[PDB]
Symmetry: C6
Subunit: 288 residues, 6 copies
């Protein structure tokens, strides 16, 4: 919905957004939205996501697809009306994204998802990309483990000529919905096949916000299949745009740069990462 502000309420909002990243307990936001989701009435649509065609499928709090749901409406504080209707396994009415309010008046944040190596990481979309054929896969997985911390991280595999990899876009989105609905730390191996169909385009556009709202982090690998020219710069551009945080390779081997958007209109941060390989290509991110 839309929000109204004057100098005073605006200053309160910014402080709140600033706190959501800098002072809130890492992962607290995720815990909060988890509570919101489980309090939702059984059978209630909570998430709509677009499929390849452009239509969208709907899920409930248990990551189960909703096939039929008689039209229902809701009136917001803003005075706007939200309406949802699922028919024949497709959203007849409604919009893509979260179908229940997780944020409330607190919007425009990059909820702290985790803390590691002396740095706070934001939830939302995190694109790992840069100089082709580098160690992007090893890096997303190490990051997945580090940010998961005490928790296991979820892995969504898509579009790679390796065993067991799904290459059907509709299964892919189904995997993403389940992931964001049930896990704080998520890895998507190769966004290569997405970058275009309507559903695919919808994904670039919706994922970051969906994740940021849930308070989860989606760490996606994006190796520029394109040339080895300054075309990567265009990819890196289209990435800072659709991402909450960016992670790109550098001149120095094993080194990556992390560019984080800490929130709406807030300062963008940058810190470095040093990594090394161990047995069976398991990558480790040096902390201290």
């Amino acid at each position: 919905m839309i929000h109204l502000y004057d100098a005073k309420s605006f200053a309160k909002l910014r402080a709140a957004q600033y706190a959501a990243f800098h002072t809130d307990a890492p992962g607290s936001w995720f815990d909060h939205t988890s509570g919101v989701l489980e309090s939702v009435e059984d059978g209630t649509p909570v998430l709509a996501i677009g499929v390849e065609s452009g239509d969208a499928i709907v899920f409930d709090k248990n990551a189960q697809r909703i096939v039929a749901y008689k039209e229902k409406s809701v009136k917001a504080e803003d005075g706007s009306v939200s309406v949802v209707q699922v028919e024949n396994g497709f959203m007849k009415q409604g919009h893509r994204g979260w179908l229940v309010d997780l944020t409330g008046e607190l919007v425009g944040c990059s909820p702290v998802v985790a803390e590691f190596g002396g740095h706070r990481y934001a939830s939302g979309m995190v694109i790992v990309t840069g100089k082709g054929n580098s160690g992007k896969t090893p890096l997303v997985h190490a990051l997945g483990e580090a940010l998961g911390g005490k928790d296991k991280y979820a892995t969504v595999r898509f579009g790679e000529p390796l065993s067991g990899y799904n290459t059907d876009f509709n299964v892919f989105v189904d995997d993403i919905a389940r992931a964001m609905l049930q896990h704080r730390v998520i890895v998507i191996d190769s966004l290569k096949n997405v970058i275009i169909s309507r559903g695919a385009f919808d994904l670039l556009s919706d994922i970051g916000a969906m994740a940021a709202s849930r308070g989860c982090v989606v760490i996606a690998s994006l190796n520029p299949t394109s040339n080895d020219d300054k075309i990567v710069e265009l990819v890196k551009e289209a990435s800072r745009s659709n991402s909450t945080s960016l992670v790109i390779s550098t001149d120095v081997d094993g080194e990556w740069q992390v560019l984080t958007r800490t929130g709406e209109g807030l300062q963008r941060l940058t810190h470095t990462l040093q990594t090394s390989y161990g047995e069976h290509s398991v990558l480790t991110i040096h902390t201290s």
Copy 2:
């Protein structure tokens, strides 16, 4: 409708347009159209706006969508006939834009929306853009506050990987209609995802005029996701074209230029803005 003129009536028109920006009390035009809107018969369509598909949805004076409305016509002074019909929540007949006359014979104006720091600002579409990754978001919000003055400004959020941001174009237009129907000062955070679908294209084309007619100002952020080359110049071009006023960054940090179209065939004005950051990235525009 069309209007006829001879040297004398034309000179009267120009003086009137000139007055609408230079001498009218700031915000008076908004107040006037507000009165026109509330005098409208209950259930009467007042605004039609295109959705992604290209079809358009219709609203009444209370920003409530009209779903069914039996065909009805009206005969203008021009002799032309206006017809509106809504069926199944879509305009069966009519046109995009205001469905009731707010301007009358006084057209081609840039109604003064507010006065601040010794400068008058025009209503209509205001695009804030320029050298990528600058302080565009902080700037639209400060401007929102400044022009709102005694009033709160409305904020429409769209297409950013931040928490609570809607990424569905149809919700977006719904948010814009409600805003222009109820608030004089409006901020749209990121027009990035719009720039293309038919509805999106319709938006660039219709917004400025819809706002100018209402007498409200829509301050939209437009960070060129494109290259960091002279591609921004093309964006800045496509912006002077669809905007009533333009605000672009300069060589000097914190400094912006405001290019205003004061009205049909009237002189274009330019003045400078100096800004600075405070706590939690709240931007302040220096007045005196």
Copy 3:
């Protein structure tokens, strides 16, 4: 229809075409076609024009849209057959353009629409364009007044972020049909939003001839939203092509060049225009 010629009839045609611009009383052609139109049977389709989709709407001599009209045919001298049929507010049968013969055997002319400042001006399409952000709007209006002479000129407003401006293409064409059917001098403020949909493309293609045939002049503003490069030259090219006359800005401030096509295969003329601003940006074209 098609016309046959031998050296002698051809010479008579050229003399007639030459006369239609050089010796006929300015505006006499308009008066003539007005008479032809009013003699048309009531309810008879006289003008068909394409809408955005590509379909076309039909009007009668009073600029009223025809919604239903049972198929009817006519046999020309050429032996060809003209057929018109309107159903559900759309041309089921027929062609775009004038649906009744206004020209007869006298075709390929640039009927003199007016005389001013010692120069004769042709009817048809007149595009005013050149070096971006110049005084194109002030210029079309001054021209509108000058060529209107004793008569008021009609103003069609479209696609500008100013108050009261229509931004819906279908209303636009409706405004153009009414204008050409009832006024000898017409101004279209901004063809910017047209230059593409089928209806829009149809417009560039049909307007000049429709106007030339009616004997009216359509003075359209065309500010190249494009770059500030030699892209304007391409616009200026696409303009000499679809126009009867061209008006472009020069190196010298306030000066414009008028390139006129005086008729089929006839000589193209060029003369200069000196202008200056007065109060409220009202432009004046210096005569003597």
Copy 4:
């Protein structure tokens, strides 16, 4: 249909093709096909031509459109089967082009259409083009008169902002069919609006052969609306390709070059033309 050859029959064919241009009486071929057409059964489809959409309309020997024609077939010498069927004013079955055999075994010719100034001219498509804004219209008309000789030439007007010009593609093709069915010399003023829709594309592809087969000549003006760069060379290229003969302007004023294809695999000829203007821009081609 397809034809079989051995060295001997091939040599006979080439001699025949050579004769069709070099020794046959100018215009004899046209006379011959005229006889073939008038011997055709009444109501029999003889010519099919594509309209803008891609569908095609059918005509009889009197240039009257056929609206309904029950399926009918014919077996050729080749063993192939020709089938025609018209329903609802459109070819349900059949192909574009001549629907009755005018050529027989004698194909691949450029029938001499006329002789003038000591040169033989071929029937078929003749494109007049070159350096923009030159005297193309005056040139096609003089050529029309010269090649018409004792006969009047037919003039098809299309896509120019002049009075009486049709701008509807479907009327255009209707005009072309009637012309080729009834006149040996034809002028098409401006192919500018054709160069793209399916019908338009069909035209470039079919006209030359239709004309060559009939034994008539279609002299079309093609002023490159495009740049004033070496883009004209690309137009001149696309012209030698779809034309039987080419006529292009030179460095010298009033001078044109005529490049003629004398027949299948035969030598291409070139000769020069000197022209001058008289009263009312009537152009004259110097003979002796």
Copy 5:
């Protein structure tokens, strides 16, 4: 179908393919498939070829189109199933290409179609192209005669502004099917209008193989209508790709180069051709 191989069967295959070009009696393959075709049950579909739309028409051994054919299936050695069904004159089921097995286990060959001037020529698609406006038409016909030898060669005419030339793609494919079904040597004058519609694209893709399988040769003219730049090189590229043999012009007048693919994975051969003109542009290829 698919074929299985080990080192030994593979070596047998290669020897067989090598034999099909180097030692088999020229034209023997054509004779063989002719026998296979005539042994086919009456009314049995034998060839399917795509029309402009993308659908395909079906023919029987006598080059007669099949309009209705009740679904029928066949089980191959490979275990795969072939199914054909024609309804309303279109392939409801089946695939493009030969509908009966002509090759068997012997695939990947370039059957020798003829011997002339001390060189063996392969069946399949032969594209004659190179430096624009050269003697391509004279060359395909001389080649047609030479390879036809004791037999007449068939000529398919398409897309040229000459008398009697078909310009309808559907008639064209109909002509090609009849040709390949009844003649060993075939000439297609101008593939210019094909190079794009689906049917046209299908043609480039299917012809070479259809011809190679039949054991006939299709000699097609392809004059690059494109620029006179290194764009011909791109055409020459797209030609080596879709052709069995390539024939291109050289620096020396009258000289051409013949690049032949002798078979699957086999060596590509090249030899030169010297030609000269006689009366009526009949070209002769010098043998001894």
Copy 6:
């Protein structure tokens, strides 16, 4: 489905993936999935693959197309639900790829398909490409024989102007499904005609993973029909992307480089190949 990991389970996965290529008995994975497939219930869909249109056809364990299959669902460990439904010979419900789990928890592998010349080769997609018109066909076949070892390799022929070659994309995919379902080593001669339709695009995207999952290797020829410029580098790029292993030609004649992806996030290997020709172009890869 999605998989969850912590540092420990992740390390176990990587070791397992590493083992699938480095220590498992060559071809053991293929044998394993063969067992899984034959244990599948009769009539059960096991593989779905896209056809040109974009729809997909379904096969059972015997490579027989399924035409009708009443909707059926399955619940995975992940909690996700797999659903399949075939109607009118097309997948009404389901996804492209394997319809039964062959991998299980062991995903992201490059199963060793064979060992030869002291090197292990991975299953999945193998693209052979590089400097145009080289010995790509001889190379894929030698590789087919070498990797087949004790077994015969399967050969799928497509899009080449040679005898017996299928040029219909739908037959092609039918050939690929049968191959991957029944043979460990597969050769596809020319992917040239695929590189675009939806089905074709689906193929590039799905094949590698389908093969890797089955444990079979698809060796495809890809001669860049494109220029002879650095366009091949772009092809070589689009190839490393969709391939499990890459084989490209070098400066040295007969020499090729083999770039292998050994598994998810694992090290990429490179080794060289020396080859020579024998009789009838049979290529031999030098081992010792």
